[PDB]
Amino acid sequence: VKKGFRAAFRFQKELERQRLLRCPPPPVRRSEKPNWDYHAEIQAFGHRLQENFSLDLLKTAFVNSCYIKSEEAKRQQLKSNQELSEQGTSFSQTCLTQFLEDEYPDMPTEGIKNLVDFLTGEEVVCHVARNLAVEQLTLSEEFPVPPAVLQQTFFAVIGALLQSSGPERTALFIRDFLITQMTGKELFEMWKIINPMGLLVEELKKRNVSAPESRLTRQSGGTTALPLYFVGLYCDKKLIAEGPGETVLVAEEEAARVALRKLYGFTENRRPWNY
Amino acid sequence: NCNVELALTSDGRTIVCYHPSVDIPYEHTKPIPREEGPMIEQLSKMFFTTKHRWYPHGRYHRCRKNLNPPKDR
Amino acid sequence: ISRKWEKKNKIVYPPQLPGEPRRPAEIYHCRRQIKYSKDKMWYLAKLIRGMSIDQALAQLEFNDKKGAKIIKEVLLEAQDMAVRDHNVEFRSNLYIAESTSGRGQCLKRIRGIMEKVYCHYFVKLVEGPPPPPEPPKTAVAHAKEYIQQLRSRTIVHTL
Amino acid sequence: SSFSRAPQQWATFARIWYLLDGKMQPPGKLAAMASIRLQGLHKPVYHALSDCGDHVVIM
Amino acid sequence: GRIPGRQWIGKHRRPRFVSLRAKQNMIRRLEIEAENHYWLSMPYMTREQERGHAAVRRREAFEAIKAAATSKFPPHRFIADQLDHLNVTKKWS
Amino acid sequence: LRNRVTDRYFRIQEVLKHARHFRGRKNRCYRLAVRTVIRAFVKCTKARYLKKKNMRTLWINRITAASQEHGLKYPALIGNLVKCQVELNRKVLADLAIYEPKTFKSLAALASRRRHEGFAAALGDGKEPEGIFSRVVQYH
Amino acid sequence: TARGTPSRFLASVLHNGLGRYVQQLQRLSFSVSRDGASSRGAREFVEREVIDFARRNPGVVIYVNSRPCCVPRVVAEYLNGAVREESIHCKSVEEISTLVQKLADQSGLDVIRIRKPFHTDNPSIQGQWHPFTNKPTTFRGLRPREVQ
RNA sequence: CCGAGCCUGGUGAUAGCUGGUUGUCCAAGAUAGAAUCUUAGUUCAACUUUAAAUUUGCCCACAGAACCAAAUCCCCUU
């Protein structure tokens, strides 16, 4: 039995850390994790995003409705979230539609509705919410905070900002925190469509141009299991697209996607957003 | 193959390249017309590779495999 | 000397709720100090690592090995206490999930140093039909996996 | 450009078939041209770990 | 087809031959050399004019050498260092 | 044993945590590991010079591919670009060959035009006007 | 080494430089020891230079305590969640100020190996090279040795 | 296991002979010679290391160093 304490204690702390990885702790809220102070951390939220919220409006944006119900249920042995959430949703939908109209004037209203729905969807607002740390400052039913409540809370924060310091700064907020979420993605993984050749056909009927022809522009390996086909979409001796595929049908329909991108102007080359 | 329009400025200070997309004309297009041993050999002849691609690897290599790799771009 | 297998048997779960699939009962058992070596008993243990308990008992009656007799004894013991204690409602509705063997506390004598061996036998039974043998993969699986890799490859070492 | 991510990846890396006529030619010039085209060094994409080869038919 | 003892040492060595590289390398170095001869070909002074034109500078540099060699001595010892070592057991009130 | 060592476990694990992805008693036993974790850290510390060399031959392979696809060879392309005073390096030129081929098409055409302009001045050496892209920018 | 280490690609957090630069740090949790020469340095830093630091960046809340769980330390908590725990056992006030400024300047992403020093997500603007950029098309698109 | 037992002690025999000599980091650092029962070693030297006193140090043309080739001493100056 070797005399001493430093090494025995070093080993004991090492076993404690191996335990903390093997059985990770059950996730419980930062609000009751130590070193917390709500008022200062509200003010830190404000100065981090660098505009002034009215503090009471911001707090009542964070406090939910289900939390109020559960707090009464706890109390039996406050103004809610919802008005702020409705204002924030209304304004975010309207100015997201405005920004995307002014930058993409040719895109149809169904496409721009799909863009706005994508930007205000569950997954993107969940990620922007968590990586903006409203997920810590909100008050909800359980940890982790459910994504519907996160979306509602984030739009309530936007509504509090709207009532606080005006539509221009609120539009800057929506722009700089929701349109950056589409920088990098594509139109047809933001607006999920089916039968893209059909969409091309009806949209050209709106354009009063003849229905396009498909042609097989280039190919390789036509009789193995690794073919390449560029199918081009032509209209009256000239093309609007050409696209790749592992077979003729996939190539044709992907060239239809390319044609739809080029017609709506939402290509890969488009003039990047003016931040 | 090279078909571009090159130029200088007047000063002789910067070069200008002009080079747009040449398209594929309509006429240059065709229209669309509408046992383990045998196993590994027919895979090899179907994919123009050899059989050592298809013979397995043990639990040890499959455990050194990464299963959640980083993703870019 | 460490008896976590028998304590693994006494681990007790919390109660279930009606909207959950039914938990299969798990039965652990152990035979300590067999006068037989750990790797002959490994051959028998690998023989029965997947079999439904009645087929396992068939193979173990008609093997020729001292371990085969000792393992059939252990498996009958575990079936008895599984339908007696751990609430396995059907006697045959068990399958061997783990059958292992490990080495014991061997004893020594002079021949040269001869080591009279002793091994352990561990078994875990589980309610339910035995799992199907996952099919040995076929041409559609290989072609699909190759083409998935070829579609995964990128332009390496640049942007 | 403006293709989807997986069709663009397929078209970038696919396999291409090259016919090379061997009448009167020396086998080493034939071999040089086919060796480049088989390793995939006629692609600006080339890397050794990318399996970027192409097919060659010498008749 | 071998080389007897070691390849490059000894009586029979592996033959080594001069290539276009080795000749061209030797020649560009020899052309640099010819230009070196030309630029050493033309002195400015000679011995009678150079004698004594750097006496001030050489003696200055040697006084610097001599002074920096002679000014070698242990550093000073202060009080504030020793008392800063007492500042280790400092605690807040 | 008046004072003997009690912290040897942690020193051992300082070697073995870098050894854990080895193969064999290299990943378990400490003698074997020490010898083979040293060699791995040395292999790193030389692989940095190696990685610079290897990148630059990959860039030469890619620019060679694209310029041979445009009718040049790599020596002609680099030599005549440096003569026409575009100071692009291999890394950017390789990314321009892969990612931006119309710009590479123009660069190959300019290298060809500079080759034939400079060699027209070479054929008519003596009193001739300076070449069109052979005009150079010299700094006072 | 680099193979005995997880690696990552080069990352933003929330496209942090696009619209506005969002200070990617939330908290510092200091713990200094009252009667301790090991935390003499952290004591001197809390005495001298934490007021101007908190004044210098209002995005982060800085809590300090006395008598930590084991040793004096800082635990920064960043915006993307990752919690960094740096130890200021036996450091001077100068080193503590550089360590704290590094934490407050850094984003919460790891310090594991970064695979590529550049992250364009739209690399090609004239279209990425594929084998049919500049292989010239033919009459009626016939391949070699076509009868027709 | 007797070209002279075995044991205990002197005995931690004597080894110019082989083998072995355990934390991190940085820095200076290479193969005239002499004598020796000495050439499997050592003592001086030469070199090497640290610290100190200083004041000159290394290189080089010219002048210069014997009668019976390549080069080297030497030193005003630089």
Å between CA of F8 and C1' of H26: 26
Distance from residue G92 (CA) to nucleotide H1 (C1'), in Å?
73
For an interface test with G, the pick among A126, A180, A270 (most G C-beta atoms closer than 10 Å) comes out as A180
**Strand H bases contacted by the protein (CB, 7 Å):** 52-57, 61, 76-78
- Protein CA at C110 to nucleotide C1' at H3, angstroms: 40
Tokens of G70: 């084991």
Disruptive mutation site among F69, F106, F113 for chain B (greatest number of B CBs within 10 Å):
F106
As beta bridge partners, residue A215 has A232
Q: Which nucleotide is nearest to E51 (CA to C1')?
A: H77
Burial environment of residue A103 by CB neighbours within 10 A (0 to 12, 13 to 18, 19 or more):
middle
Distances (CA, A) of A5 to A2, A16, B32, F6, G90: 9, 17, 82, 9, 20
A264 CB neighbour count, 10 Å cutoff: 19
Do D47 and C154 count as a contact with CB atoms less than 8 A apart?
A: no
Secondary element (H or E) of residue G101: helix G93-105
For the CA atoms of A179, A182, A188, A193, what is the dihedral angle to 10 degrees?
-50
Distance of residue A184 Cα from the nearest chain F Cα, in angstroms:
17
Q: Give CA separation, B17 vs B14, F98, G41, in Å.
A: 10, 18, 62
Q: B12: phi > 0 → left, psi -120 to 50 → alpha, else beta; which?
A: left
Residue A207 exposure: Cα atoms within 13 Å on the Cβ side:
16
Domain that holds residue G72: 1-148
**Nucleotide with smallest C1' distance to residue E54 CA:** H78
CA distance linking residue F130 with residue F136, whole number of Å: 9
Contact G61 A41 (CB under 8 A): yes
Residue D10 has its nearest CB partner, among C151, C154, C155, at C151
Q: Is the distance from CB of A271 to CB of D5 less than 8 angstroms?
A: no
Question: How far does CA F78 lie from the centroid of its chain?
Answer: 15
By what method was this entry solved?
cryo-EM
Q: Report how far residue B3's alpha carbon sits from residue A270's, in angstroms, rounded to the nearest whole number.
A: 25
Instruction: Say which nucleotide is closest to residue F11, CA to C1' distance.
Output: H23
Range of the domain at C134: 1-159
At F14 the three-state DSSP class reads helix
Burial B24-55, CB ≥16 within 10 A → b, else e:
bebebbeeeeeeeeebbeebeeebeeeeeebe
CATH number for the domain that contains residue C82:
3.90.470.10
**SS3 of residue F63 by DSSP:** helix
Quick check: B27 contacting G, CB < 8 Å?
Answer: yes
| C119, two tokens | 């091994």
Residue ranges of the domains in chain F? 1-140
Name the domain count of chain C. Answer: 1
Gap from G86 CA to H44 C1', Å: 62
Question: What tokens appear for F74 in the block?
Answer: 């790599």
In the numeric block, which tokens belong to residue E25? 């390398």
Please indicate whether, in this complex, the C-beta atoms of G126 and F103 are within 8 angstroms of each other: yes
Backbone angles phi, psi at F66, to 5 degrees: -70, -40
SS3 content of chain F, % helix, strand, coil (to 5): 70, 0, 30
Structural domain total, chain G:
1
Q: Give residue for tokens 């747009």.
A: B20
Write out chain B residues lying below 8 Å of F24, CB-based.
none
What is the Cα–Cα distance from C74 to G132, expressed in whole angstroms?
Answer: 70
Q: Which residues of G touch F (CB under 8 A)?
A: 1-4, 123-129, 133-134
Please report residues contacting nucleic strand H, using a CB cutoff of 7 A: E 47, 50-55, 58, 62, 65-66, 69-70, 72-73
The answer to whether the beta carbons of residues G72 and G39 sit under 8 Å apart is yes
Interface of G with A in 92-121 (CB under 8 A): 121
Does B have 3 or more CB contacts under 8 Å with E?
Answer: no
Note whether C touches B: 3 CB pairs or more under 8 A. Answer: yes
Distance from CA of D6 to the nearest CA of G (A): 13
Residues G31, G87: contact at Cβ < 8 Å? no
Nucleotide closest in space to E58 (CA vs C1'): H78
Q: How many Å from the CA of C110 to C1' of H4?
A: 38
Nearest Cβ partner for G130 among D11, D19, D54: D11
- Residues in B closer than 8 angstroms to C134, CB to CB, are none
Residue identified by tokens 């090492």 is A14
Residue F106's nearest CA partner among F62, F134, F66 is F66
Cβ-Cβ contacts under 8 Å, E90 against chain G: 37, 40, 43
CA-based nearest residue to B44, from A225, D50, A227: A225
DSSP chain A: ----SHHHHHHHHHHHHHHHHHSPPPP--TTTSSS--HHHHHHHHHHHHTSPPPHHHHHHHHB-SHHHHHHHHHHT----SHHHHHHHHHHHHHHHHHHHHHH-TTS-HHHHHHHHHHHTSHHHHHHHHHTTT-TTT-B-SSSSPPHHHHHHHHHHHHHHHHHHHHHHHHHHHHIIIIITTTTT--GGGTS--S-HHHHHHHHHHHHT-PPPEEEEEEEE-TTSSS-EEEEEEEETTEEEEEEEESSHHHHHHHHHHHHHHHHHT--SSS-----
Please give the resolution of this entry in Å, rounded to 1 decimal.
3.7
User: Would you list the DSSP string of chain E?
Assistant: ---SSSSSSSSS-------HHHHHHHHHHHHHHHHHHHHHS--SS-HHHHTTTTHHHHHHHHHHHHHHHHT--PPP--SHHHHHHHGGG----
CATH number at residue G103: 3.40.30.10
